[PDB]
Design a protein around this ligand. Structure first.
Ligand SMILES: Nc1ncnc2c1ncn2[C@@H]1O[C@H](CN(CC[C@H](N)C(=O)O)CC(=O)CBr)[C@@H](O)[C@H]1O
Ligand SMILES: Nc1ncnc2c1ncn2[C@@H]1O[C@H](CN(CC[C@H](N)C(=O)O)CC(=O)CBr)[C@@H](O)[C@H]1O
Ligand SMILES: Nc1ncnc2c1ncn2[C@@H]1O[C@H](CSCC[C@H]([NH3+])C(=O)O)[C@@H](O)[C@H]1O
Ligand SMILES: Nc1ncnc2c1ncn2[C@@H]1O[C@H](CSCC[C@H]([NH3+])C(=O)O)[C@@H](O)[C@H]1O
Lengths: 343, 343, 342, 342
């Protein structure tokens, strides 16, 4: 199958076992912005669901299929690969919806559906949007979509901006300095100093922050889910050119994302920006090993490149330079092993 | 190998990837109780090491070998299976010890050593002593030990005692009762409550506590590493009879452990008891499904049975009764997925 | 002469030139602890001066000789090598004391005096007590002292203790990291990072601090000026063994000193300890490049070695170990070039 | 030529100062300076492509790398302090050994193998001329082809009159310390006059608000392509100010600009008080007595700069109000300035 060709078994086992625990579903359901915004988007475009056929990709507990059932859908196929699939069936029966919601256990790349559908629904966004590589499963499912069908969400916007933060940078540098010692219980550790700094700085930082640390207006990269192909996501290249609004030290780049549900009656937006109320995705920051000095009015140009790997994530390469001086920085991050700093 | 035959691949991969990180070594090295007691034990029995041949099982960074080098050892074989092995080689060279310490990458069950040794050293203890199943690798290595050779540590004691803690018990229902509601965004969740409760009680609780919660003197179970065979650790049966010192409700059983280094000059002890300073092992508590009432002077009798599993861990079975009353309780727990409660 | 043999001309010129400015004298006189304690020491022991012959080594503005005159001295010889000597004579005349204070311009190692003296006075203490190497001149002067004569000050005590202060360490670590940049306007600087760290950490830190940063009771080293010889100050070796009172990271060593005036009527002490009011000497701290972890009850032992150099200062070597563990640190400092942080 | 005009004691301290990495670091972090040099060199690329270049006093080497970015064919980098060992390290690690050659020693004493198309350097001090390094810059023209260029090409020194009551008043407040009859029993007053005199001989280094300026500045221009070394031994600057404002004049303020004149464009570097602050700040020299002037009046006189053997200048200023005949003067020693900046 297409899924098994691109994924380590070892990663997949752990991945689907993780989502088999009820406590993680509980943790996800309790993010009110998320759950409420999805329900808003589905119910306010009810004519896109009334008497239609629906596909839910990766239903988990089943909550989204229930929303589609509320809006008047005629038939819903709910696909799920973890053991949570057995808990979903229990809720379908105790809620008297056996005539409308059909649970199909397995991977969407591997199951057979009985008919083509009018519309697809899913929640496939990870950290920085792309983590976990589930977006590829979402696009694959378009093999079941009619020529005039729709997708919910319809498009995704990724946002990038430069930031300054001394305190975070010193905190990570302090940890690395352990390996600088010439006599730990009589043993010299210093030969490993270089290896330790590299390891710590490859960890992306997950938390939130005050918007006043941003040093320029953000740049946007848009993916249209109606038009895009699966193959498009194996190599993602994002160019940027910033016009600096403030002078100072740039310690790295900050990331977040928006998605849009474009229905027949209206468009509804879900956002994880630092100007909006907090969600379980927070925001994401990538540090430079050495900061760049820039003055107001200068331009900061470069590229962010994402290449998918077999542990269901991405290798990230970031290169940036201040155009007026030639000061240049490069860095590598492993999205697989983040540092959770919050509270 | 004897190792691959007892471990699923998926588990082994993550297990050895985990220990390839320098931060993880750093965390273990910075536990002073742990690292200092080993050094004292090796140096104060210097007649057990000077001009001897030594084996270090699972050397990680290599620290214990360096302690053996300080005590005057003639030759040390240091075996390590994760990629940390590449870093250990760097440290031996920079410390001028290539003529005495030999790093061997691989599994202790699969590599070849050229000669027999006088003494074996290792740090294989996990949660509740036995978790992670590395103690089986330590005993296996005895195929290389000369007759009348020695082991450091020499014996291990696991301790058990009954406790009372009303708040901990009450916490589990508070968490599970999330699922007991008829209209979460229009959906009735109550049918899954029972399953949620069960999931929480199968988790052993990791943290520390005030010794005044203990209700009787502990029972001790001893393993002699000079005499035991590997197969002895697949099924461990611990009978108990407690003489109650205080009246009240018993909510479950508490666990901790000691090891002893028995040298020619002196015996040295390393303890993780709640009467001693905290280590990175903390202590472990297992709840009964229902509490038992006992008055001072009564006897509490029963058995704790530990069964090894395929995820490099143990299934725990506990059965207990009050002799004067016939009041009875049980629990079965999965040590692979503990709840880290410490704050 | 003995002075010129141990000193580069270049250093000495700037040195005596520095002390020729009235503004620096103004700065020194305005240290009230300093000026008041000396006057107290001399006047309360007035019988050690009454009708006696006195020598003042390095009189500057002349202030101490006026104190000696106030206590009833018969004759005071005042030696000074800088141009401040021209200004001191002006004050002697305007205060009508020409019959009792005699200014002699030049170095104490080179001038000729008419007679032996009963008592010697001076203020020769620098940073860490020993900086500027003037203490050698003070002892050299005993060639003019009668057999049972006295010295004011009489003894000096040096104190040592271990400290913890992460922010200072990171402050110095932060500056050096400039040389870590791989692309400063397109240029790779990193090859020098090691040179920058060494340079920064060789600077002793001059300032004051809260006493709660100290991790053990101090060790004391005593110099007796009545018995000591000049040569004794060329190489100073101070061994130490600390019993740790607190667990934590040791970032370096802190230094200060006391001197005592032992008169026939009473003993008077002048102190620069962090428990006492601040003076213009402040305190001095020497950092390790890498800190040492220690527990309560452990012992920290080693030696501090001081070597005199030709720029009128000292080369400092510090070596230390935690006895229970074998953890060791070593470092080298240049007392000539401090970092003024206050 | 260097050794005949500088006392050794001075040269020692001077080259010792620049041997510290921290001072290079301090100069490199001034963005205006480094950025303007980089822009001037890169935007005039036709002036460097395939050329032979000389870098006078390269320090860390930063300017030679800019010359390398612009396409220079060969660069000779001369340096007399120990920084030379470090510059060699950076050349090697940046893989430019085939194009940059480091030469330890003074430009007056080393030998160069060939004539060059262009010379680059950063030799400017306080009020442009302090440190006397410009004479070395002009001395290097013995290696310059007849049709070569110099970067920088010209230098402008600016003068303007100022008013500042508080600064003038500060000097007496400090000097009046000595005007007291019993400091611990001693009469100090006889030294007051000498104290005042000492303070007024120091030029004040710091910055200020432009509204204290009372007339448009007067400019004195040096063209480095045409000038000879000897031109800098005696610098006579005449002035005539047309007053824009009425009030009391307390002295004269100084600053400077330099220009890079290339084939494609001219680039300017300015230290004016209307521009962002640099590490040169500005310099102010007081009159001993202030002069009253009305708007529309003319203020005329002379500033004469005389080079001395301590690698600096003696400053002589004379001024008069033409309409009234009110007159004032002062003489200052730039070698020992007062650092006032707060
Ligand atoms: N190829 C595949 N085929 C079938 N199922 C798949 C799959 N890849 C992932 N899944 C499954 O999709 C689910 C993803 N989460 C489900 C939450 C659900 N939308 C809800 O609102 O409750 C949402 C999430 O993880 C985003 Br943070 C998980 O349960 C996962 O097991
Ligand atoms: N070999 C020597 N022969 C003669 N005079 C010498 C000398 N070495 C130093 N001096 C002179 O001694 C003075 C320094 N002392 C302070 C001056 C005087 N005690 C005072 O009260 O102001 C002490 C001090 O500054 C410690 Br901070 C200076 O004026 C210095 O020039
Ligand atoms: N069977 C095995 N063969 C070889 N190494 C192993 C085996 N099982 C575990 N290890 C390693 O043993 C180490 C145990 S952690 C203790 C590390 C080190 N002795 C110290 O004192 O810091 C880990 O680094 C594991 O990767
Ligand atoms: N006569 C001389 N010969 C060689 N170098 C000199 C001479 N006079 C001064 N210097 C050096 O010139 C430098 C002036 S500072 C400029 C340093 C560096 N090029 C930069 O712009 O960052 C100092 O390093 C002095 O030591």
């Amino acid at each position: 199958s297409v899924f098994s060709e691109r994924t380590e078994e070892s990663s997949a086992v752990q991945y689907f076992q993780f989502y088999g625990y009820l406590s993680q579903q509980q943790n996800m359901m309790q993010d009110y912005v998320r759950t409420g915004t999805y329900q808003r988007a589905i119910l306010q475009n009810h004519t896109d669901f009334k008497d239609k056929i629906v596909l839910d990709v990766g239903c988990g507990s089943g909550i989204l299929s229930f929303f589609a059932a509320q809006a008047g859908a005629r038939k819903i196929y709910a696909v799920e690969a973890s053991t949570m699939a057995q808990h979903a069936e229990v809720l379908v029966k105790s809620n008297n919806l056996t005539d409308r919601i059909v649970v199909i256990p397995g991977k969407v790349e591997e199951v057979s559906l009985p008919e083509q559908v009018d519309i697809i629904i899913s929640e496939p966004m990870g950290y920085m949007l792309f983590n976990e590589r589930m977006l590829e499963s979402y696009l694959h499912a378009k093999k079941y979509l009619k020529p005039s069908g729709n997708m919910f969400p319809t498009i995704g916007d990724v946002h990038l901006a430069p930031f300054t933060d001394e305190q975070l940078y010193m905190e990570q540098f302090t940890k690395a300095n352990f390996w600088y010692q010439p006599s730990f219980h009589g043993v010299d550790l210093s030969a490993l100093r270089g290896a330790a700094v590299d390891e710590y700085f490859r960890q992306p930082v997950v938390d939130t922050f005050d918007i006043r640390i941003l040093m320029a207006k953000s740049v946007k990269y848009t993916v249209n889910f109606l038009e895009a192909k699966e193959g498009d996501l194996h190599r993602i290249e994002i160019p940027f050119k910033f016009h600096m609004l403030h002078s100072g030290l740039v310690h790295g780049l900050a990331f977040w994302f928006d998605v849009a549900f474009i229905g027949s009656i209206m468009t509804v937006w879900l956002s994880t920006a630092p100007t909006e109320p907090l969600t379980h995705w927070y925001q994401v920051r990538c540090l430079f090993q050495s900061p760049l000095f820039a003055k107001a009015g200068d331009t900061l140009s470069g590229t962010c490149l994402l290449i998918a790997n077999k542990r269901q994530s991405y290798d990230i390469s970031i290169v940036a330079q201040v155009d007026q001086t030639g000061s240049k920085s490069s860095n590598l991050l492993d999205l697989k092993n983040p540092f959770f700093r919050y509270t």
